[PDB]
Design a protein around this ligand. Sequence first.
Ligand code: WU7
Ligand code: NAG
Lengths: 104, 273
Amino acid sequence: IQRTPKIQVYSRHPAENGKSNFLNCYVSGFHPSDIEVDLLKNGERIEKVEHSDLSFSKDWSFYLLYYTEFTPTEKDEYACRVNHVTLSQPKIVKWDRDMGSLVP
Amino acid sequence: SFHVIWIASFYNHSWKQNLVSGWLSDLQTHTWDSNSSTIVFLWPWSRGNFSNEEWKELETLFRIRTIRSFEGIRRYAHELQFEYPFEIQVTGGCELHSGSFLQLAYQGSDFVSFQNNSWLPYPVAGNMAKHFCKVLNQNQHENDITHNLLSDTCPRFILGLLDAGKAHLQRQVKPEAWLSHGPSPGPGHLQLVCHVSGFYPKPVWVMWMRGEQEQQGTQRGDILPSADGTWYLRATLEVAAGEAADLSCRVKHSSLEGQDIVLYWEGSLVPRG
Ligand SMILES: CCCCCCCC/C=C\CCCCCCCC(=O)N[C@@H](COP(=O)(O)OCC[N+](C)(C)C)[C@@H](O)/C=C/CCCCCCCCCCCCC
Ligand SMILES: *[C@@H]1O[C@H](CO)[C@@H](O)[C@H](O)[C@H]1NC(C)=O
């Protein structure tokens, strides 16, 4: 039978405006292996995104790591968009960054 | 601990996809190029103790068995009740200082496996897996070759490789850590997130603390890979909005030699005045 993908987003370093970083989307636990994963910057797809070679776990479910180098600013939102046969619609998982305290 | 995985996707009788890779412990060391039929060495020490002539035979052996597998699958697909599109996964390897394995899955479920000298069907996989073992065991000389690949050729590949590239598996890379707010908390609650990034090897200790008291509400996430060969982990703690005082994250890792990373929920995080 089929299995729906788990989607986890994280940056390699703490978010610092103007400093280059690496954005990661780790997709795991899905079956079959046919899947579409995009990294989003402000809602638009990021070109030049690397991903690891397809692999699977002991329960035969597949996993992948999508990543790209990036430089966050004060306004940019980042997310991971995944489409799979188990999904009715593409699921979007945001990169959860802390922009500091709000009230100046 | 070395093993090789196969991912064969059969979309129809005319469209296929074959993905092969080899793994030392947890580091991908080899990849198959479907075009040119060549084993791609990912690192200068991927070839190990073996010469160019032996690799040419290994490429040819895997070349013949792959062509023979894909043709045999499409020839017997109807008899085996294989309905397109389907996916077959294979994983096989070894380790000493001992064990050996070779498992095959159909549509992501246990189908058949190799035991000592022949293919045994998984009983739950039913008759179609017994029919599959009839075709896999039709040539005992091929099952003897498969045996020696697992018991002899595989541990020999670990020798000339796990000794040459032993330094990388024992490398100690210190983690970095930072704190942030988490999303999706309960009403009137906060989610405190402790990130631990860039450490190697994999074993790591991380807990939210109140001084010396470990906070047992610490929810440790999955250890996620990083493309530079290091690992990443999130540890979250949900607290009432008032009780977030004197909280800190403590990280223990072999590379730190007892000098734990300790970060305090403080500054703009609280936020102070
Ligand atoms: C890339 C990195 C390489 C690095 C390696 C360097 C270090 C090596 C050290 C240890 C490695 C050893 C551990 C791995 C041991 C491997 C076991 C093995 O070779 N298994 C073979 C046996 O096939 P046969 O020749 O017996 O029978 C052929 C068909 N007969 C009936 C028609 C004649 C087979 O299952 C897999 C073929 C390749 C998979 C591709 C196809 C996917 C579907 C696969 C199954 C489809 C079955 C079809 C049946 C009709
Ligand atoms: C490789 O094998 C040869 C024997 O064929 C041996 O002399 C050597 O010690 C092995 N390992 C190397 C060269 O790292």
